[PDB]
From a paper:
These enzymes have four catalytic coppers, a type 1 copper (CuT1), close to the surface, and a trinuclear center (TNC) formed by one type 2 copper (CuT2) and two type 3 coppers (CuT3). The Tth-Lac is the only [name] that presents a β-hairpin (Ala292–Gln307) close to the substrate binding site and the CuT1 site. The hairpin comprises two antiparallel β-strands (β22 and β23) and a connecting loop of six residues.
The region with the most structural discrepancy corresponds to the sequence (G304-P312) immediately downstream of the nine deleted residues of the β-hairpin (M295-H303). It shows the coordination of all four Cu atoms by their coordinating residues, and they align well with the Tth-Lac structure, suggesting there was no disruption of the tertiary structure or the active center.
Numbering used by the authors: 26 to 295, 305 to 462
Write the structure that this text describes.
């Protein structure tokens, strides 16, 4: 039985659910531990909705500390997905929103109490949200075997998620248990020859340079929607908070390694030197006499956007020795508004990494089209909400401003966000 979160689906246009955030004893990777969970599980339940559904999610805070919930990737109003809300211990809050028309893909939910994200997310508070689309009914997709792979690492101390050290605040915290759906090196015994894998990097800081032995991956969706047609890749880098959806065509019986290949993201300090080995994430067993489906020739059209009216430059910097991080020379201040834009305009954001470490840049509320990174034209058209920048790279993003209100942009190495790498955008 392949480990995968339980699914809660909308019905009759509504997903109404109470989720408790609570310390939960679990058995994990052959040991006993108490994690912080939504819905009593790690990961939390997958919420599956359709465009136009209403979601009404009551978060009950049964932690000893305040918390809140963020709907990562969902283009909903910041008046609902409010990064400044704090739910005190013992209290509840109801999030209510409508799923946008034409939205599709894998999204996720996690805590977002500013300055206090990294320990909550590391402790196990996360889960996926899938938006089903009409495109999922085409033969080439409908007949695939679908799985969600939540890629999230963990370290334990004293049977609880390990506390943050000073080095953790600088690099972001990685764990030694590199888990898939909360399991250590599970085996997926495929029953069908085409797999549709939804991939979520819900780690604090760990990157996953994914490859499947002997199989290309056919990328069909990025963070925030479908590509226009499948893109064959040999490997796929998922930075923290990124998602993707891929098709895998099992052409031959066998036992295949899905691995996270070595990737140097510019971490510094005390660490083993000498090269890193690939980390096996899962074993994939192909069925007898597999006959895969043909690929879809087309997926969904990417919209032509208006010409942009303004260009913004956001510069990321570091003070690695203080573990403080900055956008345009300042640390986040919840009282300050850094950027002001108009609703129903398009902007170009040039995000420039002037540090030594990779930084995966994220913008709430307003999905963007990546035009280029590092001067290189992006290989597909799809909505994204996280983009990785290596040292010295500039990413050029086309940002349609939709929903009014104040929201945030930040690095999704969540320790960096907590240590200052976040700013505030107001759309009016
Ligand atoms: Cu009914
Ligand atoms: Cu997020
Ligand atoms: Cu977000
Ligand atoms: Cu960062
Ligand atoms: Cu955020």
């Amino acid at each position: 039985s392949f480990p995968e979160p339980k699914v809660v689906r909308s019905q009759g246009g509504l997903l109404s659910l109470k989720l408790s955030a609570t310390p939960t004893p679990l058995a994990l990777a052959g040991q006993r531990a108490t994690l912080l969970t939504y819905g009593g599980s790690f990961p939390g339940p997958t919420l599956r909705v359709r465009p136009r559904d209403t979601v009404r999610l009551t978060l009950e805070n049964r932690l000893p500390e305040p918390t809140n919930l963020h709907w990562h990737g969902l283009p909903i109003s910041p008046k609902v997905d409010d990064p400044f809300l704090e739910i005190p211990p013992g209290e509840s809050w109801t999030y209510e929103f409508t799923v946008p028309k034409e939205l599709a893909g894998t999204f996720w939910y996690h805590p977002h109490l500013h300055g206090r994200v990294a320990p909550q997310l590391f402790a196990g508070l996360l889960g996926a949200l899938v938006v089903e689309s009409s495109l999922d009914a085409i033969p080439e997709l409908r007949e695939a075997e679908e799985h969600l792979l939540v890629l999230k690492d963990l370290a334990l101390q004293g049977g609880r998620p390990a506390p943050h050290t000073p080095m953790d605040w600088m690099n972001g915290k990685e764990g030694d248990l590199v888990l898939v759906n909360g399991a250590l090196r599970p085996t997926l015994v495929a029953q069908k020859a085409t797999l549709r894998l939804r991939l979520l990097n819900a780690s604090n800081a760990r990157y996953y340079r994914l490859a499947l032995q002997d199989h290309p991956l056919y990328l069909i969706a990025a963070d925030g929607g479908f590509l226009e047609e499948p893109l064959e890749v040999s490997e796929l880098l998922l930075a923290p908070g990124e998602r993707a959806e891929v098709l895998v065509r099992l052409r031959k019986e066998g036992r295949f390694l899905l691995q996270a290949l070595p990737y140097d993201r510019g971490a510094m300090g005390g660490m083993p030197q000498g090269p890193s080995r690939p980390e096996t994430l899962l074993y994939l067993i192909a069925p007898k006499n597999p006959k895969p489906l043909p690929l879809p020739k087309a997926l969904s059209p990417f919209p032509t956007l208006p010409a942009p009216v303004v260009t913004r430059r956001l510069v990321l910097t570091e003070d690695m020795m203080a573990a403080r991080f900055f956008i345009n020379g300042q640390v986040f201040d919840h009282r300050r508004v850094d950027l002001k834009g108009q609703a129903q305009t398009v902007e170009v954001w040039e995000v420039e990494n002037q540090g030594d470490m990779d930084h995966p840049f994220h913008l709430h509320v307003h999905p963007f089209q990546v035009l280029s990174v590092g001067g290189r034209p992006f290989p597909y058209r799809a909505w994204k909400d996280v983009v990785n920048l290596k040292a010295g790279e500039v990413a050029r993003l086309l940002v349609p401003l939709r929903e009014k209100g104040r929201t945030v942009f930040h690095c999704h190495i969540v320790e960096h966000e907590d240590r200052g790498m976040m700013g505030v955008l107001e759309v009016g």
